[PDB]
Amino acid sequence: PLTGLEIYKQLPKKNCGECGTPTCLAFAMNLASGKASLDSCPYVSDAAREALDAAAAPPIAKVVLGAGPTAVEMGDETELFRHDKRFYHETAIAIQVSDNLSSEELKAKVEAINGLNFDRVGQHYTIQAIAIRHDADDPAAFKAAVASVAAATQLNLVLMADDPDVLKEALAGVADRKPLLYAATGANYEAMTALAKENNCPLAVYGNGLEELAELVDKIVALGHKQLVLDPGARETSRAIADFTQIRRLAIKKRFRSFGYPIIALTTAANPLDEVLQAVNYVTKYASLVVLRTDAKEHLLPLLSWRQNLYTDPQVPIRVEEKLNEIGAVNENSPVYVTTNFSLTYYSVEGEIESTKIPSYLLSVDTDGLSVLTAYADGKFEAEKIAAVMKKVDLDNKVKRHRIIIPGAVAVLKGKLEDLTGWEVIVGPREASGIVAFARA
Amino acid sequence: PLTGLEIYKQLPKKNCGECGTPTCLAFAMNLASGKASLDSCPYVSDAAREALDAAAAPPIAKVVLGAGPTAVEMGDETELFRHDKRFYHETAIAIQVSDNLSSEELKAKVEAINGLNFDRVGQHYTIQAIAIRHDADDPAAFKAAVASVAAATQLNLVLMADDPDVLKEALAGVADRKPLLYAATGANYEAMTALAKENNCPLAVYGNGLEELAELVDKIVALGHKQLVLDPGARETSRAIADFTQIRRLAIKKRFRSFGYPIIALTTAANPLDEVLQAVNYVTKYASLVVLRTDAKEHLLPLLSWRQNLYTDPQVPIRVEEKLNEIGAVNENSPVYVTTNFSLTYYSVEGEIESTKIPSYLLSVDTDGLSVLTAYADGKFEAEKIAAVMKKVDLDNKVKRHRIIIPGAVAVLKGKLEDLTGWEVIVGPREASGIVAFARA
Amino acid sequence: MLIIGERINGMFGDIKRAIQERDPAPVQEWARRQEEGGARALDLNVGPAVQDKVSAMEWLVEVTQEVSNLTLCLDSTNIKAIEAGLKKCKNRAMINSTNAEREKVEKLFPLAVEHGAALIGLTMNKTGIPKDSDTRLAFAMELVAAADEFGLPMEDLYIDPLILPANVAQDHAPEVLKTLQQIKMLADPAPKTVLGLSNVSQNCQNRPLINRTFLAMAMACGLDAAIADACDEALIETAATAEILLNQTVYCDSFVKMFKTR
Amino acid sequence: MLIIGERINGMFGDIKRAIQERDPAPVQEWARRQEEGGARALDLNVGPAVQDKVSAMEWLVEVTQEVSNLTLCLDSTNIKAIEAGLKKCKNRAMINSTNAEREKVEKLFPLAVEHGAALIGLTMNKTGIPKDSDTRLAFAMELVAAADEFGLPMEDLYIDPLILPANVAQDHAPEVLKTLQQIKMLADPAPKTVLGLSNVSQNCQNRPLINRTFLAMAMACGLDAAIADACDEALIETAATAEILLNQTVYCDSFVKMFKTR
Amino acid sequence: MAVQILRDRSRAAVQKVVLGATKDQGGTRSHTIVVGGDAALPFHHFEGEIVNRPVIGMEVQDIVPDWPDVLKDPFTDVINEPGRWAQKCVAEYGADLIYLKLDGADPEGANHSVDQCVATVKEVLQAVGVPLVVVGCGDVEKDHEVLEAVAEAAAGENLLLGNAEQENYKSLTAACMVHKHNIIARSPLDINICKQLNILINEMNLPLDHIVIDPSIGGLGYGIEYSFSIMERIRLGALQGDKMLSMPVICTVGYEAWRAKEASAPVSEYPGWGKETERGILWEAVTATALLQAGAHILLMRHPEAVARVKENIDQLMVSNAY
Ligand code: COB
Ligand code: COB
Ligand code: SF4
Ligand code: SF4
Ligand SMILES: [Ca+2]
Ligand SMILES: [Ca+2]
């Protein structure tokens, strides 16, 4: 997977045939095909080094945020759109906290951060890290902050301190874990690189625009370290989307080895509500690790919801559990509706019935998360299959009066389903939207 | 290019992910594609040389017999059938002369061997080498024999003697033009390879069957001598056709490195006429070098003619020199036939005219060796082009009339032509076969 | 190109009713109508409609080879049903189909070698159909490694990259071609391939136009077999013409007729 | 898929008579119906008969663009006639043709850059038309390199592996497809490919069947443009369908109509 | 070295649909609103012009809505007066458009007469000066009578009549042509049907600049990503020359977001989710924000604070990031 021109353009163009090939242009053909190796031609040096590295490497590199089951993976992406292919690694969420704050307020805020995990749609949303920033006067307040937070929380960390000396002294007692080193700058990158080198921690790279970022990255990479996250220095959301796209584009569409690393985004919106919406634009536009300031459950829920949806494989359908779902009151005198486990189908029905206002039982038959008609065609939805799901519930005992409602779209099944299940099958409306009419009648 | 199976088989079975790929099988996929370098896996040493060879090396290697302008390239073949692609290197015909024959009987034969050159249909056929065998009782007779042949001929040489010690003394003087040391046997391959190594000469490998051949070839390869020609030991034509096919098949379609070398055959038919036909089979069945004991000029011309025809590129058409070919003893009242220089077309015409015993002039218009209809369709046979050949060819000086005959298939060309050439154009029969009846009328 | 007739499937109205009442007449007719079309192989599927598969599969095998000698292709997921059909097969067989999962591999792979039949292998897993061709190749490579494992000739292995409708899943069609194109390069000798051609035009306007078009495109990428409608004359012509353009069969003026009368 | 109208060629009768007496009516009319068929390009050829290739070329250009805004494809081996035509082009044009000959490259490649037009490059030289795909790829690599050498947009380079009749040169068709599919490994972004489709069915029986079959097969290998009969409605449908099967255009039930009226 | 800004040049662009008409144009509106005209991916100023910013329309019904108690709170003073409801959404909340959702036309529910529906439309037209987006109730037979009468009386105002699906576009399209109005093409999360629908509507000789696409978006956490990908694929095709997908995209984020439990369910019921006040605001806001990156031109919202925070987002996204 390497263009013959890209190979030839790097060649000395001597046409000596010491490679065993009449010309370089023909040797470039043999390299793209694989007839001969590139180590044969004794000519050139740095040309052969970059070629092998570029040909056999992903566009976006992978840098892990620490070790253990708590560690998360960032970067490693090959797409600009989710429909072309699935997005692999979800956005890393990190809540920021200052060091000049009091200990009682510090612990109270950290304690609240550990509770930023939600349960919805049979799914579990969680955050990843905590950002400890240095705003105090004394450099000893920062080390007293990171060690304090690391004693309360068990999540990942990301250290934010300009002076490496202040950072290292605060890093030493936590260097064995994750803590990302934010950030390297064109004035203090040397010391910052050495800290992340010996301690084997990821190193954040700051830059003023695309240019300064690219120049600084190459220098840090040349020092031997390749575990980096990128920061174009974008503080405005419009400037962010543009810059965040370039890193994703140039690395994938141009193999830019300076932007072949994930992106760390910083929220700047003063208002917590505006920050959440600004975070949505980031988690959508190729940002890997975003740093929030607001830590409210009211705010983190819509963000973590969109993050989950965007990073779902378009191939695999969203599915709910194959277990009787009680709607409203129930009480043993309620309608039983048969449907499939596809999340989209299930909630279409769940939504319609909550609307109905009559407590209902909803049995989402396990069709591997397929919409009943599709499952139907598969034959996954069968009278034998639905009948068997009735039993697992052992529902007939559960309901005093026996009946079940079938989606109108598979109306055909009702005789066969009725006869082997022993349950009176009513064929409902083809669309769950008419469930209310059925309830009325 | 190699296969996914070929890599996985050579690959171990650790599934350790040290290469950056989860399993060994998935690593084979990345190699056949080119996603990663194989140097990551630290395992094995011969496999790295085996994979590098099999993927890069052609089916058959090339070993050169001789040195300079008189050197002939054997092997280097990639085809089973000549219609898939053209056969590249013609058969190396060699003549055998025994040493036991007296000095006068040894000179008269080689004198005739040099005269084995032929000129036919505008092409020249020649032989390649001379074979000196050892049937004498005394070893010292071989040194006097090879010296007698060395001064007589300038063609390539191939020495035949079992004992290496007897062979080396006679090899001393003629080791400059790289003779063919026949042959290597499992009983003396140690001394044979060592001798062929110092002088850098092609070493013939003998074996009683394909198994003993393949085993012995591998023994020589380990010593560092790859200039080998194979001898399956098949003395019978049915055995040879079968064996030579196997050597040719296994090397091309199975990457059998033991058989990835040209083949040397030995005509064993007692009768001289039976020998030539046996040689026809061999040169047709992938034989790179056949040794004949016939020195008659009658037995070599058809044998060399068939060799020339078989090794012609089908894609590249045979062409006749553009010019005038007088059929018989043509006078200044005889006819002039216009045609093209495609050899097939020209002899179709030459055959019909000579066959009807019509003395005449034939003008094969250069059409890059294309047939009359194609030349016409490729704009290669314009009235302009034919007119120019009428003047180009010097045919006018030859005849008292100014009349030319056009192939009936381009009958319009003739009318158009008459005007710009100043010759009277008669449109002949569409097929050269009707020429006799056209000239009669 | 090996055209495998698809009509004998339990999803159709006539075939379904011919199983419940056990009527050989419609089954035998389609076994002959597809042969006249040009199909040198027949696909036998009992369908979801029939209650028992063991009896239904064996019933189809007999009545099909009663008036035909074409290579029969058993189409089911049930392992017992497949082996049940292989028993009454007096002619050559072809198991359809299997996936890369070992639970399916261990059961069907030696079952194909035992009767010396062909094995259609799907490039899918338990989760579902892969998107990218790289994953289709991954499941294909495993089918090749499992082919050299159980000792099965590669020319009997029919890789199935699967094909989805060009309306709901249009983005799969170019991936299937990329799959087929790289299938021949991942193994030597190269495994054969087979597609459910009629699936690409499901719920699409002008189905035959889409069917034969994708067939030519698939054969250009290297398609050996194809399970489609043999009663479609326009489809047979394209399948025949593609052989000439691939230089698989020597050209003649009546190249269409010769493929139909192979 | 770009369709270049082949009908306006001097080899045809009505076209030749129209050039001799300078009659715009047949030339202008054919420009309409080919556009009605769905062609977005027109190939203009003066023919072998006309003695003044240059002035006749300029005439064809000046009368075709009068009733057509389509991209003109100047079909002439004469460089002087090619440049002369480009001087009269109201819009963007295409050059047909150039070979891998250095003497032609240094004259036609800058000529394409100067006018900012497209360039069709043949994978051949003075020897003739190669057979092996490895040989066609050699001349193709030179053309790609020549494009970058003279600063030509890579997507403006239309490489043509050249197609020959499927009866007398059947062994070329599979090689051309292997050339198209392997052309992608020459540049990034990769150059475009073009073919003279109608040549594949020369002297063959049922030409339209062979034409549209090979066109679909070539698109799967990566055919971007094709000089074929735009009046063949079955050919246009094939180009439209194969374009959908490559996910180059969002599917709709009226996909053919969206191709003709694109 | 240097850093080369990769700019993707677009072959074509998304259509420009003019909403509303002034006095000189035979209408009675104060100003006109133009959407679309984008020459690149959403908010990619560095590689294309974004001449017109996306707009936000607030939902107004002829009757009181069945919205949750939380959503009804900011409208309690004018929720039962469509004329006063529209005026507040424009003056107090600063809406760009008025989304007149006539749920009262439902024969089962309010069963408002045809003369009543057309009276409500005329009432809003006399209340505000912004362009209107009037859609039916969802009843095929009823909407055929309502939307036809509304288009005939409000002819000249250049309204945006809503929802003309695949099986039902015949009656509505004809009304838009005769009385010079725009139309909404709604498709059940299918770009193929979406493209085919725009053909059938256009084949009736209706200009392509009078059509807006409704992909039938899903709410946040309820298949929003299925619509997100479609809206992107539509956006790509529009730039790739596909004229059938060149129509601007409208989104009913109000209906899809407030029908979720996570938007209105009390904090006491779901403590892990937090206060239902701002959680409901952000639920509709994030839904709109995510779709803005997909190519949303007209957002149909409900909650005031939700609209305000989305406008702030649009205000920043329109800031040119051109290199
Ligand atoms: C919400 C859901 C939306 N519907 C969808 O989301 C499915 C849309 C769609 C395009 C179908 C056509 C279409 N768009 O109209 C097409 N597929 Co699909 C090509 N498919 C898929 C998609 C599956 C997506 C999924 N997770 O289910 C795939 C591409 C993988 C796909 C695959 C198949 N598909 C197949 C087929 C044939 C069909 N597929 C259909 C469903 C359709 C109609 C297309 C066609 N036309 O031919 C076929 C089924 C009809 C038929 N047999 O004739 C098949 C077999 C094709 C093949 N040969 O491979 C294959 C299945 C086997 C396989 N995987 O190999 C798609 C997307 C579809 O609808 P729903 O019916 O589940 O719920 C719905 C709900 C909302 O209105 O209310 C009703 N309701 C639901 N539950 C209940 C009620 C109502 C009441 C009262 C209740 C008490 C309960 C009502 O039923
Ligand atoms: C001996 C020779 C055999 N004839 C042949 O060997 C040619 C056979 C054949 C199949 C043609 C059809 C067929 N088989 O019938 C077909 N080609 Co070819 C596809 N072609 C080729 C082959 C070239 C072989 C060669 N070296 O010339 C190619 C595949 C490369 C080939 C190529 C072309 N071909 C082309 C064409 C069109 C034709 N080709 C023809 C000749 C034919 C007839 C095919 C067809 N159509 O039906 C076309 C020409 C007729 C026409 N214009 O209508 C073309 C232009 C295809 C294209 N679209 O480009 C292309 C040429 C340009 C290019 N290279 O790009 C082939 C093989 C043919 O015949 P001949 O006519 O030269 O001699 C013959 C001789 C023996 O009977 O007697 C006569 N005669 C000869 N000299 C004289 C006389 C008689 C008298 C009295 C004299 C005084 C002199 C008579 O003329
Ligand atoms: S040895 Fe190197 S420089 Fe010489 S021709 Fe080969 S590739 Fe070019
Ligand atoms: S490094 Fe070698 S042994 Fe280890 S998993 Fe990779 S291929 Fe297998
Ligand atoms: Ca094949
Ligand atoms: Ca291409």
Coordinates of N, CA and C in Angstrom, one line a residue, chain C residues 166-168 170-174 177-178 181 184-185 200 203-206 209-214 216-221 234 237-238 241-256, chain D residues 166-168 170-174 177-178 181-182 184 200 203-206 209-214 216-221 234 237-238 241-256:
Chain C
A166 N -28.5 -3.0 -2.2 CA -27.8 -1.8 -2.6 C -28.6 -0.6 -2.3
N167 N -29.6 -0.7 -1.5 CA -30.4 0.4 -1.1 C -30.2 0.8 0.4
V168 N -30.3 -0.2 1.3 CA -30.1 -0.1 2.7 C -28.6 -0.1 3.0
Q170 N -25.7 0.1 0.6 CA -25.0 0.3 -0.6 C -23.5 0.3 -0.4
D171 N -23.1 0.8 0.8 CA -21.7 0.9 1.1 C -21.0 -0.5 1.3
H172 N -21.7 -1.5 1.2 CA -21.2 -2.9 1.4 C -20.7 -3.4 0.0
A173 N -21.4 -3.1 -1.0 CA -21.1 -3.5 -2.4 C -19.7 -3.3 -2.9
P174 N -19.2 -2.1 -2.7 CA -17.8 -1.9 -3.1 C -16.8 -2.7 -2.2
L177 N -16.5 -6.4 -3.4 CA -15.6 -6.4 -4.6 C -14.2 -6.4 -4.2
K178 N -13.9 -5.5 -3.2 CA -12.5 -5.4 -2.6 C -12.1 -6.7 -1.9
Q181 N -11.5 -9.3 -4.6 CA -10.2 -9.0 -5.3 C -9.0 -9.4 -4.6
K184 N -8.1 -13.8 -3.7 CA -7.2 -14.6 -4.6 C -5.7 -14.4 -4.2
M185 N -5.4 -13.3 -3.6 CA -4.0 -12.9 -3.4 C -3.6 -13.3 -2.0
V200 N -28.5 -8.5 -3.6 CA -28.0 -7.2 -3.8 C -29.1 -6.2 -4.4
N203 N -35.6 -5.3 -2.7 CA -36.4 -4.1 -2.5 C -35.8 -2.9 -3.4
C204 N -35.2 -3.3 -4.5 CA -34.7 -2.3 -5.4 C -35.4 -2.3 -6.8
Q205 N -35.5 -1.2 -7.4 CA -36.2 -1.1 -8.7 C -35.3 -1.7 -9.8
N206 N -35.9 -2.4 -10.7 CA -35.2 -3.1 -11.7 C -34.2 -4.1 -11.2
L209 N -31.5 -5.9 -13.6 CA -30.4 -5.0 -14.1 C -29.3 -4.9 -13.0
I210 N -29.7 -4.9 -11.8 CA -28.7 -4.8 -10.7 C -28.0 -6.1 -10.5
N211 N -28.8 -7.2 -10.6 CA -28.2 -8.5 -10.4 C -27.1 -8.9 -11.4
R212 N -27.4 -8.8 -12.7 CA -26.4 -9.2 -13.7 C -25.2 -8.2 -13.7
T213 N -25.4 -6.9 -13.4 CA -24.4 -5.9 -13.4 C -23.4 -6.2 -12.3
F214 N -23.9 -6.6 -11.1 CA -23.0 -6.9 -10.0 C -22.3 -8.2 -10.2
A216 N -21.1 -9.4 -13.2 CA -20.0 -9.1 -14.0 C -18.9 -8.4 -13.2
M217 N -19.3 -7.5 -12.3 CA -18.3 -6.8 -11.5 C -17.6 -7.7 -10.5
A218 N -18.4 -8.7 -10.0 CA -17.9 -9.7 -9.1 C -16.9 -10.6 -9.8
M219 N -17.3 -11.1 -11.0 CA -16.5 -12.0 -11.7 C -15.1 -11.3 -12.2
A220 N -15.2 -10.0 -12.4 CA -14.0 -9.2 -12.7 C -13.0 -9.2 -11.6
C221 N -13.6 -9.3 -10.4 CA -12.8 -9.3 -9.2 C -12.4 -10.8 -8.8
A234 N -31.3 -13.1 -19.2 CA -30.4 -11.9 -19.3 C -29.2 -12.1 -18.4
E237 N -26.7 -14.7 -19.9 CA -25.9 -14.0 -21.0 C -24.7 -13.3 -20.4
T238 N -24.9 -12.5 -19.4 CA -23.9 -11.7 -18.7 C -22.9 -12.6 -18.1
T241 N -20.9 -14.0 -21.1 CA -20.0 -13.0 -21.7 C -18.8 -12.7 -20.8
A242 N -19.0 -12.7 -19.5 CA -18.0 -12.4 -18.6 C -16.8 -13.4 -18.6
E243 N -17.2 -14.7 -19.0 CA -16.2 -15.7 -19.1 C -15.2 -15.5 -20.3
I244 N -15.8 -14.9 -21.4 CA -15.0 -14.6 -22.5 C -14.1 -13.4 -22.3
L245 N -14.6 -12.4 -21.5 CA -13.8 -11.2 -21.2 C -12.8 -11.5 -20.1
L246 N -12.9 -12.6 -19.5 CA -11.9 -13.0 -18.5 C -11.0 -14.1 -19.1
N247 N -11.2 -14.4 -20.4 CA -10.4 -15.4 -21.1 C -10.4 -16.8 -20.3
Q248 N -11.6 -17.2 -19.8 CA -11.7 -18.4 -19.1 C -12.1 -19.5 -20.1
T249 N -13.0 -19.1 -21.1 CA -13.4 -20.0 -22.1 C -13.1 -19.5 -23.5
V250 N -12.7 -20.3 -24.4 CA -12.3 -19.9 -25.7 C -13.5 -19.3 -26.4
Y251 N -13.4 -18.1 -27.0 CA -14.5 -17.4 -27.7 C -15.0 -18.1 -28.9
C252 N -16.3 -18.0 -29.1 CA -17.0 -18.5 -30.3 C -18.2 -17.6 -30.5
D253 N -18.7 -17.5 -31.8 CA -19.8 -16.7 -32.1 C -21.1 -17.0 -31.3
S254 N -21.2 -18.3 -30.9 CA -22.3 -18.8 -30.1 C -21.8 -19.1 -28.7
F255 N -21.2 -18.1 -28.1 CA -20.6 -18.3 -26.7 C -21.7 -18.3 -25.7
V256 N -22.8 -17.6 -25.9 CA -24.0 -17.7 -25.0 C -24.6 -19.0 -24.9
Chain D
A166 N -12.4 -9.1 -28.5 CA -12.4 -10.3 -27.7 C -12.4 -11.6 -28.4
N167 N -12.4 -11.5 -29.8 CA -12.3 -12.7 -30.6 C -10.9 -13.1 -31.0
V168 N -10.2 -12.1 -31.6 CA -8.9 -12.4 -32.1 C -7.8 -12.0 -31.1
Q170 N -8.5 -12.3 -27.4 CA -9.2 -12.5 -26.2 C -8.3 -12.5 -24.9
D171 N -7.0 -12.7 -25.1 CA -6.1 -12.8 -24.0 C -5.6 -11.4 -23.5
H172 N -6.2 -10.3 -24.1 CA -5.9 -9.0 -23.7 C -6.9 -8.5 -22.7
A173 N -8.2 -8.9 -22.8 CA -9.2 -8.4 -21.9 C -9.0 -8.7 -20.4
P174 N -8.5 -9.9 -20.1 CA -8.2 -10.1 -18.6 C -7.0 -9.3 -18.2
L177 N -8.0 -5.5 -17.4 CA -8.6 -5.4 -16.1 C -7.6 -5.5 -15.0
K178 N -6.6 -6.3 -15.1 CA -5.5 -6.5 -14.2 C -4.6 -5.2 -14.2
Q181 N -7.0 -2.5 -12.2 CA -7.0 -2.7 -10.8 C -5.7 -2.5 -10.1
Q182 N -4.6 -2.6 -10.8 CA -3.3 -2.4 -10.2 C -2.7 -1.0 -10.5
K184 N -4.0 1.7 -9.3 CA -4.1 2.5 -8.1 C -2.8 2.6 -7.3
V200 N -13.7 -3.7 -27.8 CA -13.7 -5.0 -27.2 C -14.6 -6.0 -27.9
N203 N -16.1 -7.2 -34.5 CA -16.3 -8.4 -35.3 C -16.9 -9.5 -34.5
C204 N -17.3 -9.2 -33.3 CA -18.0 -10.2 -32.4 C -19.5 -10.2 -32.6
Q205 N -20.1 -11.3 -32.2 CA -21.6 -11.4 -32.2 C -22.2 -10.8 -31.0
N206 N -23.3 -10.0 -31.2 CA -24.0 -9.3 -30.1 C -23.1 -8.4 -29.4
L209 N -24.1 -6.6 -26.0 CA -24.0 -7.5 -24.8 C -22.5 -7.5 -24.3
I210 N -21.6 -7.6 -25.2 CA -20.2 -7.6 -24.8 C -19.7 -6.3 -24.3
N211 N -20.2 -5.2 -24.9 CA -19.8 -3.9 -24.5 C -20.1 -3.5 -23.1
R212 N -21.4 -3.6 -22.7 CA -21.9 -3.2 -21.4 C -21.4 -4.2 -20.3
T213 N -21.1 -5.5 -20.7 CA -20.6 -6.4 -19.8 C -19.2 -6.1 -19.4
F214 N -18.3 -5.7 -20.3 CA -17.0 -5.4 -20.1 C -16.8 -4.0 -19.4
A216 N -18.9 -2.8 -17.1 CA -19.2 -3.0 -15.7 C -18.0 -3.7 -15.0
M217 N -17.4 -4.6 -15.8 CA -16.2 -5.3 -15.3 C -15.0 -4.4 -15.1
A218 N -14.9 -3.4 -16.0 CA -13.8 -2.4 -15.9 C -14.0 -1.4 -14.8
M219 N -15.2 -1.0 -14.5 CA -15.5 -0.1 -13.5 C -15.2 -0.7 -12.1
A220 N -15.4 -2.0 -12.0 CA -15.1 -2.7 -10.7 C -13.5 -2.7 -10.5
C221 N -12.8 -2.6 -11.6 CA -11.3 -2.6 -11.5 C -10.9 -1.1 -11.3
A234 N -29.1 0.5 -23.2 CA -28.7 -0.6 -22.3 C -27.3 -0.3 -21.7
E237 N -27.7 2.4 -18.8 CA -28.2 1.8 -17.6 C -27.2 1.0 -16.8
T238 N -26.3 0.3 -17.6 CA -25.2 -0.5 -17.0 C -24.2 0.5 -16.3
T241 N -26.0 1.7 -13.1 CA -26.1 0.6 -12.1 C -24.8 0.3 -11.5
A242 N -23.7 0.2 -12.3 CA -22.4 -0.2 -11.8 C -21.8 1.0 -11.0
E243 N -22.3 2.2 -11.2 CA -21.9 3.4 -10.5 C -22.5 3.3 -9.1
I244 N -23.7 2.7 -9.0 CA -24.3 2.6 -7.7 C -23.7 1.5 -6.9
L245 N -23.3 0.4 -7.6 CA -22.7 -0.8 -7.0 C -21.2 -0.5 -6.5
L246 N -20.7 0.7 -6.8 CA -19.4 1.1 -6.3 C -19.5 2.2 -5.3
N247 N -20.8 2.4 -4.9 CA -21.1 3.5 -3.9 C -20.5 4.8 -4.3
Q248 N -20.7 5.2 -5.5 CA -20.2 6.5 -6.0 C -21.3 7.5 -6.1
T249 N -22.6 7.0 -5.9 CA -23.7 7.8 -5.9 C -24.8 7.2 -5.1
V250 N -25.5 8.1 -4.3 CA -26.6 7.6 -3.4 C -27.7 7.0 -4.2
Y251 N -28.1 5.8 -3.8 CA -29.1 5.0 -4.5 C -30.5 5.7 -4.4
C252 N -31.2 5.6 -5.5 CA -32.7 5.9 -5.5 C -33.3 5.0 -6.5
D253 N -34.6 4.8 -6.4 CA -35.4 4.0 -7.3 C -35.2 4.4 -8.8
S254 N -35.1 5.7 -9.0 CA -34.9 6.3 -10.3 C -33.4 6.7 -10.5
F255 N -32.5 5.7 -10.3 CA -31.1 6.0 -10.4 C -30.6 6.1 -11.8
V256 N -31.3 5.4 -12.7 CA -30.9 5.5 -14.1 C -31.3 6.9 -14.7

